[PDB]
Design an enzyme around this catalytic site. Sequence first.
Site, PDB file in Angstrom:
ATOM      1  N   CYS A   1      -5.035   6.586   6.730  1.00  0.00           N
ATOM      2  CA  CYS A   1      -4.109   6.084   5.723  1.00  0.00           C
ATOM      3  C   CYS A   1      -2.662   6.067   6.192  1.00  0.00           C
ATOM      4  O   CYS A   1      -1.824   5.452   5.526  1.00  0.00           O
ATOM      5  CB  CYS A   1      -4.210   6.927   4.452  1.00  0.00           C
ATOM      6  SG  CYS A   1      -5.889   7.169   3.843  1.00  0.00           S
TER       7      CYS A   1
ATOM      8  N   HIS B   1      15.937   7.436  -2.022  1.00  0.00           N
ATOM      9  CA  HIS B   1      14.615   7.132  -2.545  1.00  0.00           C
ATOM     10  C   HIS B   1      13.540   7.746  -1.664  1.00  0.00           C
ATOM     11  O   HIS B   1      13.685   7.839  -0.443  1.00  0.00           O
ATOM     12  CB  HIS B   1      14.399   5.622  -2.654  1.00  0.00           C
ATOM     13  CG  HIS B   1      15.442   4.927  -3.466  1.00  0.00           C
ATOM     14  ND1 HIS B   1      15.543   5.079  -4.832  1.00  0.00           N
ATOM     15  CD2 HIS B   1      16.438   4.083  -3.108  1.00  0.00           C
ATOM     16  CE1 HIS B   1      16.552   4.356  -5.280  1.00  0.00           C
ATOM     17  NE2 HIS B   1      17.112   3.742  -4.254  1.00  0.00           N
TER      18      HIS B   1
ATOM     19  N   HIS C   1      -0.927   6.695 -10.545  1.00  0.00           N
ATOM     20  CA  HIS C   1      -1.489   6.451 -11.868  1.00  0.00           C
ATOM     21  C   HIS C   1      -1.931   5.001 -12.035  1.00  0.00           C
ATOM     22  O   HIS C   1      -2.966   4.731 -12.653  1.00  0.00           O
ATOM     23  CB  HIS C   1      -0.465   6.826 -12.937  1.00  0.00           C
ATOM     24  CG  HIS C   1      -1.027   6.874 -14.322  1.00  0.00           C
ATOM     25  ND1 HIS C   1      -0.923   5.822 -15.204  1.00  0.00           N
ATOM     26  CD2 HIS C   1      -1.696   7.850 -14.977  1.00  0.00           C
ATOM     27  CE1 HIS C   1      -1.506   6.146 -16.342  1.00  0.00           C
ATOM     28  NE2 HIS C   1      -1.982   7.372 -16.231  1.00  0.00           N
TER      29      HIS C   1
ATOM     30  N   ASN D   1      -5.389   5.445  -5.200  1.00  0.00           N
ATOM     31  CA  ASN D   1      -5.120   5.708  -3.789  1.00  0.00           C
ATOM     32  C   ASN D   1      -5.501   4.469  -2.986  1.00  0.00           C
ATOM     33  O   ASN D   1      -6.638   4.316  -2.545  1.00  0.00           O
ATOM     34  CB  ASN D   1      -5.884   6.939  -3.315  1.00  0.00           C
ATOM     35  CG  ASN D   1      -5.578   7.301  -1.876  1.00  0.00           C
ATOM     36  OD1 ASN D   1      -4.834   6.605  -1.190  1.00  0.00           O
ATOM     37  ND2 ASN D   1      -6.156   8.397  -1.411  1.00  0.00           N
TER      38      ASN D   1
ATOM     39  N   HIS E   1       3.133   9.090   0.121  1.00  0.00           N
ATOM     40  CA  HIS E   1       1.844   8.418   0.074  1.00  0.00           C
ATOM     41  C   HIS E   1       0.999   8.995  -1.051  1.00  0.00           C
ATOM     42  O   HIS E   1       0.918  10.213  -1.222  1.00  0.00           O
ATOM     43  CB  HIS E   1       1.136   8.566   1.422  1.00  0.00           C
ATOM     44  CG  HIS E   1      -0.340   8.334   1.363  1.00  0.00           C
ATOM     45  ND1 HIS E   1      -0.892   7.133   0.977  1.00  0.00           N
ATOM     46  CD2 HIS E   1      -1.380   9.147   1.657  1.00  0.00           C
ATOM     47  CE1 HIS E   1      -2.208   7.220   1.022  1.00  0.00           C
ATOM     48  NE2 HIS E   1      -2.530   8.432   1.435  1.00  0.00           N
TER      49      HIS E   1
ATOM     50  N   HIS F   1       1.162  13.860  15.423  1.00  0.00           N
ATOM     51  CA  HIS F   1      -0.283  13.878  15.614  1.00  0.00           C
ATOM     52  C   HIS F   1      -0.708  15.322  15.824  1.00  0.00           C
ATOM     53  O   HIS F   1      -0.386  15.923  16.853  1.00  0.00           O
ATOM     54  CB  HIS F   1      -0.696  13.008  16.800  1.00  0.00           C
ATOM     55  CG  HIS F   1      -2.068  12.424  16.672  1.00  0.00           C
ATOM     56  ND1 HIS F   1      -3.178  13.185  16.377  1.00  0.00           N
ATOM     57  CD2 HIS F   1      -2.510  11.152  16.803  1.00  0.00           C
ATOM     58  CE1 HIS F   1      -4.244  12.407  16.327  1.00  0.00           C
ATOM     59  NE2 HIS F   1      -3.866  11.168  16.581  1.00  0.00           N
TER      60      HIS F   1
END
Lengths: 399, 427, 372, 372
Positions: free
Chosen positions: B169, B318, B351, B355, B322, B248
Amino acid sequence: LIIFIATVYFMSKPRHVYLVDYACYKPPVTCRVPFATFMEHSRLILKNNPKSVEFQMRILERSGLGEETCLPPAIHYIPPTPTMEAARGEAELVIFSAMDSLLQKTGLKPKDIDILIVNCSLFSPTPSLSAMVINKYKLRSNIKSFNLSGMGCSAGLISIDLARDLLQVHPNSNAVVVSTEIITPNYYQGNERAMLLPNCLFRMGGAAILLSNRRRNRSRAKYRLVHVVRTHKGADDKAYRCVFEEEDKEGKVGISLSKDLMAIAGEALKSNITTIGPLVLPDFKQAFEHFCIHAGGRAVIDELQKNLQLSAEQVEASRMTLHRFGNTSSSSLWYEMSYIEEKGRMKKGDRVWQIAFGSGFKCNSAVWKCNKTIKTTTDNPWSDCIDRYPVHIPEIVKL
Amino acid sequence: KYVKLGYQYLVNHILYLIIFIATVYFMSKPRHVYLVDYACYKPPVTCRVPFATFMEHSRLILKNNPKSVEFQMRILERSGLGEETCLPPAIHYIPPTPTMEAARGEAELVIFSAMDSLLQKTGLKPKDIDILIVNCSLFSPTPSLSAMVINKYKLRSNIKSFNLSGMGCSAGLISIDLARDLLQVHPNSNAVVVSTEIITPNYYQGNERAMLLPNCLFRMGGAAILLSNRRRNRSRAKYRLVHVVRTHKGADDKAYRCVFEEEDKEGKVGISLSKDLMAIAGEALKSNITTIGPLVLPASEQLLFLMTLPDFKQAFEHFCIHAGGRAVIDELQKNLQLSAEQVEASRMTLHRFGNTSSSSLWYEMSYIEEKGRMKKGDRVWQIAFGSGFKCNSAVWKCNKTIKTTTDNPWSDCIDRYPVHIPEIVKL
Amino acid sequence: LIHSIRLSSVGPGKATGSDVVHELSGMDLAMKLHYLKGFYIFRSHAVQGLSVKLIKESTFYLFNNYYWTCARLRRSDSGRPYLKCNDCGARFVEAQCDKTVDELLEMGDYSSFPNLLVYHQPIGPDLAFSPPIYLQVTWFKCGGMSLGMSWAHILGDAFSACEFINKMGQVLTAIKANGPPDPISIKWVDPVGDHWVTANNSKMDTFSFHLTDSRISHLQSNIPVFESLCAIIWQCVANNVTICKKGSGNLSNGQIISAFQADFSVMEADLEKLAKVLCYDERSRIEETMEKGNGVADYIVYGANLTFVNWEDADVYGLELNGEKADFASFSIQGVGDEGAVLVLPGGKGRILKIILPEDQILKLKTELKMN
Amino acid sequence: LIHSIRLSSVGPGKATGSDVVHELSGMDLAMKLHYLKGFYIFRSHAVQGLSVKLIKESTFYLFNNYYWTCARLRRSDSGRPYLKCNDCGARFVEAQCDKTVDELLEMGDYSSFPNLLVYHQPIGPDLAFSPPIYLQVTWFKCGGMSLGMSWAHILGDAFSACEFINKMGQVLTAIKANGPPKDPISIKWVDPVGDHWVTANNSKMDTFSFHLTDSRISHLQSNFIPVFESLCAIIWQCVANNVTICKKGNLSNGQIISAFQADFSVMEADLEKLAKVLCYDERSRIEETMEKGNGVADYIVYGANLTFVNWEDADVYGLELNGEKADFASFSIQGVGDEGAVLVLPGGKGRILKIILPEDQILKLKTELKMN
Ligand SMILES: CCCCCCCCCCCCCCCC
Ligand SMILES: CCCCCCCCCCCC
């Protein structure tokens, strides 16, 4: 006046990319699959489809493959039962063997790897294969890792082009390119003829290549990258669909090849040559000392030899790689290269033209220049068979 | 360690007779990368999946595994998802039957919708696309998704196309970083980045509790982003890319195996999650934040940190966290002391759209834009995380004040969406 | 006969908001053990251009107006059931038939159509996960299409179900063209708990037949058509009698229920006697009875006392796909007490009579009508 | 008992080369209807740290020396079979057994062991696709292991098969240690079988094994080097004309085969008389008759007459895994003729006698032998 004419050139000059070394995986003899065994297993598996067995016989008779090509263990069981565990095991075996060979023959420390690109078309686990390499060799957290998937048999040169650009951006860095195709998930378990051809030709193989732009590698590097040219025929619908992965009538997934596939291939190859002619030409075959045609098929090598008027010696490496290792996908080009190095034919200043082709019919090519005369060694996949391998390959292998 | 990485990068970043001094600078400065525009896919209402329908389908499917149904109910009660999240058509059948035809159909729908919206928005011609990067973690047909886009829109034969698969993701920011580098190399060029996750093949058909959470959380979505280094785009660009930081944690064995695709006892493939996933996620987020701190914090905060050897709310206007989990947003808000309004976009995106693996950052950006809160010069911090436990972050700077539009995923719900999300959703 | 059955869910395209409920009135609770089965059969000409995707989209846009038909049954503290509008949806079924519409209509024995072209499951034994609406779409070899609905009687009466189906058709056409937008009539039965099914001592069976205008006029030798037919069938069946006619968009059980108790010899009675009986509203009584029980006691309407049903005003043929009415549309009651029922439906020049009784009584009635 | 059977192929690690063939002699052709079934059983200790991968690797390195055992049968222009060395391989089988080695070795008669622990298929009916060697590895619950081999008799005799298996064990150990490297009377003409090389019997052949100890041997000898000679004489008398003897004489059919026609009635003959006639080679004449048929004729060796095989000197317990011999090893012949056979195997100080005869004769012998 001198500054604006000198420093402008010096600051706009591309960085030199060097192929420091590369290692080719050597499949064990325990994975060997002769023609008779392949045909017997095909008879036992496709017991209810005689025409599929006959089609596979016809394909393998004229394929140009030898008796020493290899398939992974899972495919050796009469009905193969591919599992994700077997695919992971094969991927680990091939990739770790190649990476170990590369790190041993280059002296490269894992902490000195800044870029890592792994390309394998069909196999793609959720933790990418690049993540597997990072975990295996404990690479840095800020490593630039990329996993190219689904881009076919020409994706090795795509990885090379990506490494070239990244080495343009990042000074004093090393890139490692792992080109492989895991056969265990590739195997087609149905009986549709259009999807059976890949099973007859694809064999085990892999390659790990170290590229660098460090000045310390400017003298011990094997090659310097000159050009990479990419062609994409995906805009044409016929070229886009000529190699398509899909389900058959029984719901089993495979790769269907169109009847016009050969024609499409021809066109793509022509385009690539027409794009690389003005970059190397002062007659195409006189601009290069060596040729590496991807071993994706005997007919394609025949067509290229006929069109470019190449000699038997100039296409020798490609034919011998097809005979010895079969169609190992994107890594094929690196076995062929090894062949030229193992005959003691790669001299300093020699120009090598590699060409590869695949799905979506991308067709890519790369021009390399030899940086130093390469001496024969014993740590290459051709070591145990080079002394005999310029062999006669019959047009039809009789079973 | 990670402070050292941040300062090492900063050493090579703060750097950026008359003719010579001018040229030694103008010819070594990085090219500016601009986010010209982006389009988010808006799944149709025919794909929505309310809580009750999901639980009824779970009860009907896992009829012989009551504990699995109970686990799914517990997971989805506290997930923070709404009633308007969507799943692809193939998953709406009581026994889902995911085929590759359905996966290709969903991929075409999402990607072509996003690309059509992008091309309509920017007036971009397909012949002007020089780079194309597509990232989808699980779906990877033999002709690439990038090849599919090239066929659909008839892109040039010398297109620089890349298909990144299996990178989780967080691979959207990997695609952004790759586009940034390629635009450094190639002047006067456009790059298109498509980020998506096709759910039809991602769906897990077993009953193991360790493998059922992705079924509960992952929902439909996609994004197409246009990046450029052309001087003409410098005025109409929405953002300027400032930073990208990659982390990583694959070297650690526990982090490597925390999200692992594998077969279960019945031979069905799915994504197993470890029990220590939260610890790995916290460590990776902390490492990424530590690495990026030196590049964005005011010199005052950095000097304060060095003396007692900070506050990231002062480094950014801002935040786009994720939407990979309610707990991760909770923990980031607690540790960074973010206000309710600073995590509002992330919570609302979770909401509204659930995801969406690698495109959720762009839904959050759209949410911020559609409230009229993105002003010229504002700084945006996007953070994503995923398998291999890669954790990536990006810093953008608004290039022009963004006016609200109507061709966005939030157009039909923004007027109400700052809503109350209960801790437990009762069935 | 029917193969390749696929299940899925449909429902409103717009969330209705949490805490929304839908109260069930006394009439709704008195009908909670009954269901409606209605199927329409179209030839390929009318269903040209339609796919399951379009029907599903139209249903998604239709349930916005009927979101409570996608609700699920809950029980309050006092035990009175109600509909919680959680947008769980209605069940959707896709089926294939190896026959053709022409072949299917050339059988005569249509009695099996309600069971094969309509997917039905009773509410319960767990109320919280039982949809009140099942929709089935069946595809035939010739290209024709069947649409069947199982409809819980708590949602409404037959006219409400017909209105619902007509709205579905209208929404489909609009999407295609313009783009997306103490009483006696009830009998107390042993509690059925959360399994809402009508219990029958005997094996109930249905027999249907069409009567033309000439047959009705001849039988009328002695408004009046329905009464006269009811009298004929009542006399042949031969005390308590129930009648159920139409009342006076919105979904409701707006149906006039009446009952008569006859302490006389129906066996030997003049026809005009029974006609005057039948033609010479118990909603209030039923409402009070169900209110005094807090909605926990269970009652059956159909099959209580030889129910008579007047659906000649029902829009059984109101579903028009591509401006074409169904080749064959029919409706019936699933769940009928021992006393059985008689249903009048709008045929052509006459009426279609369906009769539900125990099998032995069905044979006796067939013998009785063999010469009448 | 046996479940989870997986098939695979093994073969030489090195390509043999094109146009390589292997000629079958007259003895090999005369042996082509017979097969040898052997099996070895080791406890969990001997096979510790031994996976299927290691066994497969050892077989791959073993077949380099025995590449022709992986060949496939072809017919020449005249029709004489030969072995084309195309490296088609030998069949490999993996099996699981719920039982343990102790349970298997303590369950009375080991009559079903050859059938279950050895995977056997005859050559044919398609010669070109029939492996002459089947190997099977069975894993038991306790961790013990069984290795069974079905071996075509064209490849060699029991001693050759035992040498092959011992070489397999040696290769495995070396890899673990140092890493990878006149009308003949003994043969009967039989009805042609074409390409399906199976011995046809017009009866139900059955086996009977027992473990004559080092004591009863002398006890029976006293009734009247030639130990097996006296055993053969006793068995000949018990089963009572024509007699055949097979005894020990790189894989070859090196067995010394002799026959002895008899005229004196065996029943009423002294034991020492029969021992004398027994103890006091037919390869030349057998090869001559085979050549006179161009190798197309079919002949049966075992069971052509009353056959006695002397395997007491065979190295049955030659396979050593991790230096430990097999807990239980046995060998037998599949494809015996109607007359029957009597194999003598080593039992340390004793002998194991496997009699193969029609089932009724086996039942008769069960009682006949007990008298002595
Ligand atoms: C508003 C009604 C929506 C109708 C569509 C419902 C689709 C349900 C998606 C599938 C839910 C799967 C539950 C998990 C099963 C293991
Ligand atoms: C020499 C025999 C080695 C084992 C060969 C296994 C063949 C498996 C591939 C067959 C695919 C149909």
